[PDB]
C-alpha cells in the first residue's frame, strides 16, 4: 500500500488491519520471517517494524499507471542530469 516511502510500520496499524492484539504482533511477524514472505527486522525501542519486502506478486492496471508516472519521473530525471554532465564536461570529453 505504501510504495517504500516510510516502510517502518508501527504496531497500531497491524493491530488495526489484522484485528490482532498487541501481544501477538511479535509472534505474527516471526512466523512471516520464518516462511520467507519478507526479510525485515523488528525494533521495540519505538515499537516499529522495519520491512524489506522481497516476495513479489501480481498487480492490476491501476498500479501500472502510477508505476509509469514514477518511471516517467525516473526517465526525465536521469536524462536531465546527462544533459548537465554532457554540457559541463564537453571540453574534456574528446
Amino acid at each position: 500500500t505504501r510504495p517504500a516511502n516510510h516502510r517502518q510500520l508501527t504496531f497500531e496499524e497491524i493491530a488495526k488491519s489484522a484485528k490482532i492484539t498487541v501481544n501477538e504482533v511479535e509472534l505474527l511477524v516471526m512466523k512471516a520471517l520464518s516462511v520467507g514472505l519478507v526479510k525485515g527486522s523488528i525494533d521495540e525501542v519505538d515499537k516499529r517494524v522495519h520491512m524489506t519486502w522481497v516476495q513479489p506478486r501480481v498487480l492490476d492496471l491501476q498500479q501500472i499507471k502510477g508505476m509509469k508516472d514514477r518511471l516517467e519521473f525516473w526517465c526525465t530525471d536521469v536524462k536531465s542530469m546527462e544533459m548537465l554532465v554532457e554540457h559541463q564536461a564537453h571540453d574534456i570529453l574528446t
Binding site: W74, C75, V78, E82, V85, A89, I92, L93
Partner: peptide, 16 residues
C-alpha cells in the same frame, strides 16, 4: 568521464 557518459547513454535506452 566518457565511460560515465556512454555508460549512461545505454541506461535510459533500457529505460525507454
Amino acid at each position: 568521464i566518457t565511460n560515465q557518459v556512454h555508460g549512461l547513454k545505454g541506461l535510459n535506452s533500457k529505460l525507454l
